[PDB]
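Summary: Need help interpreting a holo structure output

Steps to reproduce:
1. Submit the protein chain below together with the SMILES for calcium ion.
2. Request a joint structure prediction with the ligand placed.
3. Inspect the structure token block that comes back.

Expected: a single structure record containing both the chain and the bound molecule.
Actual: see attached output.

Input attached:
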Amino acid sequence: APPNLTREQAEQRAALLEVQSYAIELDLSAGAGGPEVETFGSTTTVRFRSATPGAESWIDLVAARVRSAVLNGVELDVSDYDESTGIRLPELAADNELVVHADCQYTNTGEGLHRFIDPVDGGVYLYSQFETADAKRMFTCFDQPDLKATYQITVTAPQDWKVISNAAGEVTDTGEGTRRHVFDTTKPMSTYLVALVAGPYAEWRDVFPGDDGQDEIPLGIYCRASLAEHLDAERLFIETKQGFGFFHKAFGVPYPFGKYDQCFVPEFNAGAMENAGCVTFLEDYVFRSRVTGYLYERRSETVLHEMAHMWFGDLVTMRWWDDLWLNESFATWASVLAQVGATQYTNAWTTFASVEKSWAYRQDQLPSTHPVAADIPDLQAVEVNFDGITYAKGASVLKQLVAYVGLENFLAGLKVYFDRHAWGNATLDDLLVALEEASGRDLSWWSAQWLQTTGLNMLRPKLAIDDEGRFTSFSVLQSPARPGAGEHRTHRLAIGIYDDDPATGELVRTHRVELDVTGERTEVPDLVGVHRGKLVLVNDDDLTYCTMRLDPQSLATLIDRIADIQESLPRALCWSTAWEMTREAELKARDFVSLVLGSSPTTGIGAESEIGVVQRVLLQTQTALASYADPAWQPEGWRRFAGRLLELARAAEPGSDHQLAFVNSLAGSVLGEEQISAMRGWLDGTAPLEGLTVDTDLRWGLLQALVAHGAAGEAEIDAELERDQTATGRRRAERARSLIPTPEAKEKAWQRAVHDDQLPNAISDAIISGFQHPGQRELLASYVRRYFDEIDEVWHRRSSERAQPTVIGLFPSWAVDEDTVAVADRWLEGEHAPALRRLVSEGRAGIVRALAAREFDRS
Ligand SMILES: [Ca+2]
Ligand SMILES: [Zn+2]
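--- attached output ---
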């Protein structure tokens, strides 16, 4: 039970103490033995000062055993040591030295020093994960972000292991089967960013050359030896170098650390983590099979997100976890800026509008919404009070702050902020003050308007035109923020006018005006006299966070000609408005389906050039069909969708990303006999689709679809697993087994996913990922009751990180009916953990919205 540090306790300890240095010695010599190895030696020497001689404090440590603790030469009594109370430090002097010898535990969870044994070759791999407060599982420390210090880490490790930390180091043979790795003393940094990766990782090396008073940066990439054949190091290094050329120019500050290593690590819960000089990534970013450009784009965005943190987060750190939203929102915004500015992903604002903004809007339009900023009174509150809306809306609203301040001004402000707070801590207010000084804006009201509120403003044009089609008047109308307190926010936004390009017949932007929009109505004098064209967007360039609506002529143009919009971003904003309208019972599901499917090679989603938009819109369509369409129309809708997607798959360029996307969308669809027959032929090779690479993972996707339709079963799944006898094959097999369309199979899947804790986590998740399928809704009816009866116990029995996939993934989102709402209502009258209630409330809210949309679809 590690401690639940409170904000006030952190403040008290930060007021009293200042830490200079940690010197850490880790004995990992036993670490390459079998699963019976539990502990490693951890010695820490801390030097720190106290503002009050004679005061008492405490230091943190989660250890199996504390052998010794000595403060200023006095042995401390560690006989009653408990991880929840750490080590008390009585009678402090002005200057202090503490030496602790302990045995700490390896973990197989999301916290501390994680240990994994590779079943392919028996290699043993370690990596640390410390955010928020798990550094205390590896060494003794004042584990809070505002007590920065330097770290000098020495490790003794098995001789065949590489060892990577925050700084570069020197390695010497001990002649005792081990090597000693002495890392340079780091620059001052927070404990949660200290890193250690160790094991027989494969290594690739490169360098980002010295560039305009930034020292050269040595670069490394690491992954498990068993994955190395599929790691595309050269592409990763290209993107990495593009980021390092971009960020020091945008931020006006050189890379603050000495080198940069990126490690793909096993069983990683956290996704990616910005440890200074030593970034960790999940292994799903090493692609064994063909994937579309969208996944490469996403991976590059993650790479640049963590790189942005080397400045914002690691050079200058939040004082307390209540600014975690800001840390993440900034890094996401910065990652996309860098994508557009320095990489091949020059359409990344299209992605951000299509994916992140949409994700934000989908959640924030529900009564279950909450603000971005939250009070964080202790560590536990980080894990419960920050979620999907926090991150996607946070990034979205930060993009708007950047617009309101002005991009050049925002970057100037960041330079001052980095200079002013380098090597120390800062808060949101410190940033806002920098931005105010860089722009002349007043930002005193911004937080209250944007970070402490819920809900969306609708923005739409109110226009009047003369006989020539020229505006005589033009206003932006803003609705009250809902669901929420109805404020009218202040935005910086752009209005774009679009009309036919005579040469091509595409819709191109003929006028753009940027302005501040405030209150209920804002006149736009710049547009008086301008030709209205065919389409008006009042959130052109996607600068603000809103519900954009169109005037009637513009809406008719969208419906008739969305695919003729030339640039990807306005076109994506039109897809997003249409989807938002469908979600909110303003556009019928069947009309959204018809817009997406189109009727020709040049209409609908089949004409869309951005693969990420294709993929996302196709997913939204599948959701519209299952959730939002009137049940009596759903079979017809699925027939139309499956038909059109087979046509598109067959018409697509051989070997193209578009081909593969259409095939993958089929694989998640309700399929008719014609499509089942074509898919079988693609899988077994009796009638292949020309150019389609039917590799290991595409075989699984096709087979899974066949299983779901009854066309393949246990024997075929077992045969497939025999040809892909790997960890990934095992997960794919489980998803296929869960898809078997029988009551016995669903019962077994539920039992294993919900009640078998011996299963690895990723096998549990895989099982869950095949439980639902849009063709099998009737098999799932009895699991509405099962879910609500069992989720409390699951939440109690599993950690909340182990419970969430089950709570989210088995929420009965399929059972769109008033009976389900009523079961959920009653559950919600009971006593339950708040984080659980939040998830259940959100799923309930989705069903209520769906019921409303179905009623609209049959109007
Ligand atoms: Ca964590
Ligand atoms: Zn981040």
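--- end attachment ---

Reviewer comment: Residues 834-857 form the longest helix (24 residues). The CA atoms of residues 462 and 475 lie 5 Å apart.
Status: needs-info
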